[PDB]
Amino acid sequence: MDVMNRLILAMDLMNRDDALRVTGEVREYIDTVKIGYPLVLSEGMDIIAEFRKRFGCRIIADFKVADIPETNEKICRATFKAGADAIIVHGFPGADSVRACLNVAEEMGREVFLLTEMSHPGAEMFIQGAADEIARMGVDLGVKNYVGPSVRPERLSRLREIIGQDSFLISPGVGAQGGDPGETLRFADAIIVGRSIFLADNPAAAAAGIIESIKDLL
Amino acid sequence: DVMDVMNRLILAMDLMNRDDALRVTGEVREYIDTVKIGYPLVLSEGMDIIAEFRKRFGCRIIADFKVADIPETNEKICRATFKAGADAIIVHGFPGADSVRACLNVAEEMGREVFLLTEMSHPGAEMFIQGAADEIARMGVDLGVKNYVGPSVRPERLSRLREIIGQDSFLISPGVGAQGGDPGETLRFADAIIVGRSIFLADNPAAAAAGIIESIKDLL
Ligand SMILES: O=c1cc(O)n([C@@H]2O[C@H](COP(=O)(O)O)[C@@H](O)[C@H]2O)c(=O)[nH]1
Ligand SMILES: O=c1cc(O)n([C@@H]2O[C@H](COP(=O)(O)O)[C@@H](O)[C@H]2O)c(=O)[nH]1
Numbered sequence: 001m002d003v004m005n006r007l008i009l010a011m012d013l014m015n016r017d018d019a020l021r022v023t024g025e026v027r028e029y030i031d032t033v034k035i036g037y038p039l040v041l042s043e044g045m046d047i048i049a050e051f052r053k054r055f056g057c058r059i060i061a062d063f064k065v066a067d068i069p070e071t072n073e074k075i076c077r078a079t080f081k082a083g084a085d086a087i088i089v090h091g092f093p094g095a096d097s098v099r100a101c102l103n104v105a106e107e108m109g110r111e112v113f114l115l116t117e118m119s120h121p122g123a124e125m126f127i128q129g130a131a132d133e134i135a136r137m138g139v140d141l142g143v144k145n146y147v148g149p150s151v152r153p154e155r156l157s158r159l160r161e162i163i164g165q166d167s168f169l170i171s172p173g174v175g176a177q178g179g180d181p182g183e184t185l186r187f188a189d190a191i192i193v194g195r196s197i198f199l200a201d202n203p204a205a206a207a208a209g210i211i212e213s214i215k216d217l218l
Numbered sequence: 219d220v221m222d223v224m225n226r227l228i229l230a231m232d233l234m235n236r237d238d239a240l241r242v243t244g245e246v247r248e249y250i251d252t253v254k255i256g257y258p259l260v261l262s263e264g265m266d267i268i269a270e271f272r273k274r275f276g277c278r279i280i281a282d283f284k285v286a287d288i289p290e291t292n293e294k295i296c297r298a299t300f301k302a303g304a305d306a307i308i309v310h311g312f313p314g315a316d317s318v319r320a321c322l323n324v325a326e327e328m329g330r331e332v333f334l335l336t337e338m339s340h341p342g343a344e345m346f347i348q349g350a351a352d353e354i355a356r357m358g359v360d361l362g363v364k365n366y367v368g369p370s371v372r373p374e375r376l377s378r379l380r381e382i383i384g385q386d387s388f389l390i391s392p393g394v395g396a397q398g399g400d401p402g403e404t405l406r407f408a409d410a411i412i413v414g415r416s417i418f419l420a421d422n423p424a425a426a427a428a429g430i431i432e433s434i435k436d437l438l
Contacts, residue, residue: 012291014294014297014298036287037287037291037298038294038298040261041260041298041302042265042298044264044265045261064286064287066284066286066310067256067257068338068339068340068342068397069340069342071232071256071258074257074258075257075258078234078257078258078261078262079261082261090286092312092346092347093338093340093342093343093346093347094340094341094344094345095342095345096340096341097340097342098342118288118313119288120289120313120314120317121314121316122313122314122315122317123313123314124314125314125357126312126313126314126346126350126353126354127312127313130346130350133346134346137345177288195290
């Protein structure tokens, strides 16, 4: 997966007008947008097709799928029908739930990203202790795409070690949550950035600035 | 101090087609006044489906969104969900206390309820969730969570969850019917059972619901 400027926009604005305007403002800097439930639940799944029509970007549906296998399959079907190129799945609910997602993705020509460890403080309670094993489970299942936390580079590095250099790894928590763009790209293929761009006075200037700071990694 | 679930039976409406979802829910409305709507239906038909159910049936709506993000995003998801008219939302506990608190804070501000999912009913739950479930439940109690979800298919685990949360907490339980859980046995511990496929895929969903209710008649 070739992500322009190694930068994925997390578009979590909840207003269609603002989301389209801001994305348009930064479109020259990205070709990959992560769309999550804040936008989808506020404006509908039709927003995905609208982004493809306007921007011709790839779309990662950040739905943190975390149900039983039966329901996971339905969620993935509905999501790929709406035009998502990929979907993010939690690993914590175990292997059968992940495999359900992998099956639908294969059927529809899409990718699954496995969320290992998360970036927020609460991740330390239960997720962090399971994260290495979740990553190994991903390897066992043939998962090739992973998500891990920018805010804990030692954990992100360990995740990279587990999955190998051939796997694709993207990482949120850059900017607002304190992660550093350059340090994160030591280990991740691409960084995910939301508020640092979309809440900025000048979103285009914010995006440009982040890219300038990693210019030599591109 | 808890929602009054008619017949102790909650419909899991996981049909993905608006016409079928509406038809089946209409057919069982005399037996059930509380409906669980999840992402299969919402991602297929939009959040306005919640409005449509309220308009047609006047049923309570539990949004089964298994919220499992960072606190910032959890807040936004809860806000959007309550704005659409959901009475309650289901939240995962495994992402930890700050993520749960974020949902509780929005629910408090907006006058709605959070249900905390503590262990799940599928085989995969044994890998990571089961080992964390007792602590997730205890965390819920510490945070002031009053409503919980736990699995019908592991009666020993459901019983332990009930112990942890106490008799005053509200507990609902899926996995009844299609996944093998027994209505009566489950209601030893849960306030209400959640049933999906064994009602909505039945030739006669009303008869399926009526039959389940007949089987637990002495527990109502
Ligand atoms: O561990 C994780 C996994 C995520 O998907 N995310 C997501 O990545 C984005 C981060 O946005 P921001 O740059 O504003 O902090 C949000 O959409 C959030 O839901 C995260 O922050 N941490
Ligand atoms: O542990 C759990 C938690 C759930 O929410 N569920 C949900 O409960 C419902 C079960 O439906 P069914 O009766 O068709 O098996 C589904 O909506 C599923 O997503 C579950 O099955 N197990």
